[PDB]
Amino acid sequence: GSMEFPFDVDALFPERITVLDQHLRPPARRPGTTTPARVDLQQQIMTIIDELGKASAKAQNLSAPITSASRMQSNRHVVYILKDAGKGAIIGFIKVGYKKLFVLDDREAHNEVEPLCILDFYIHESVQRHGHGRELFQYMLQKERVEPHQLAIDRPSQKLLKFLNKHYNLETTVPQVNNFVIFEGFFAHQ
């Protein structure tokens, strides 16, 4: 069963996919809604992002999370949170950001670029492989306004590489020495 919290997630996140940045801005509601204080709502969001980061860390066999509320506030990352039993539940998230990279082309030459990067990506195990990952990824691409092949991927797992191959035909890679993966077509757009 997906991730449940001691507060009303549906009240907190009206949309199915919630977009948050360093501001950690609680989504607007409608007038009928009375609301808890903003500081409290932000704390709820901070807890959600902390727990998501930890769960993603467990899924990826990481000894420490790469996504946290604290990290979100001190960086320029964007998280897209997919939400799902009165309290509501969280299915998963994807986190992106622009990063400066020293990238190898097909001629083993290093190029300074700053592409959009897929930094963290997680769907709760109970409902993995149900198409939820694609749902998040499609929404992100649209909002971020980028093509799949324009992306750099930070340490992509075996699951993600299949995911990208199936859904976007990202198959051929240009080997890197950092732990980022780029795909054929990455440099044409550069």
Ligand X SMILES: CC(C)(COP(=O)(O)OP(=O)(O)OC[C@H]1O[C@@H](n2cnc3c(N)ncnc32)[C@H](O)[C@@H]1OP(=O)(O)O)[C@@H](O)C(=O)NCCC(=O)NCCS
State the residues that interact with ligand X by CB under 6 A: 59-60, 121-123, 128-134, 155-157, 159-160, 162-163, 166
Residue 81 binding result from ligand X, Br ion, none, given CB thresholds of 5 to 8 Å by partner type: none
Closest to ligand X by CB, 54 vs 155, is 155
Question: Which of 2, 18, 44, 67 is the binder for Br ion (CB under 5 A)?
Answer: 67
Closest to Br ion by CB, 34 vs 63, is 63
Closest to Br ion by CB, 71 vs 83, is 71
Under rule CB under 5 A, residue 56 binds Br ion: no
Under rule CB under 5 A, residue 72 binds Br ion: yes
List residues forming the annotated binding site: 121-134, 157-166
| 96-99 LR contacts (CB < 8 Å, sep 24+) | 96/140, 96/144, 99/152, 99/154
CA distances from 12 to 94, 149, 183 (A): 18, 34, 37
Q: Residues in the chain, how many?
A: 190
Closest contact distance (angstroms) between CB of 98 and ligand X is: 17
Q: Which residue is nearest to ligand X, using beta carbons?
A: 133
Residues in contact with 132: Cβ distance below 8 Å, sequence separation at least 6, in sequence order:
82, 91, 92, 123
Q: How many chain residues touch Br ion (CB under 5 A)?
A: 4
If you compute the radius of gyration of the chain from its CA atoms, what whole number of angstroms results? 17
Residue 16 binding result from Br ion, ligand X, none, given CB thresholds of 5 to 8 Å by partner type: none
Residues in contact with 121: Cβ distance below 8 Å, sequence separation at least 6, in sequence order:
56, 93, 94, 95, 133, 136, 137, 160
Under rule CB under 5 A, residue 71 binds Br ion: yes
List residues forming the annotated binding site for acetyl-CoA: 121-134, 157-166
Q: How, if at all, do strands 110-113 and 77-83 pair?
A: unpaired
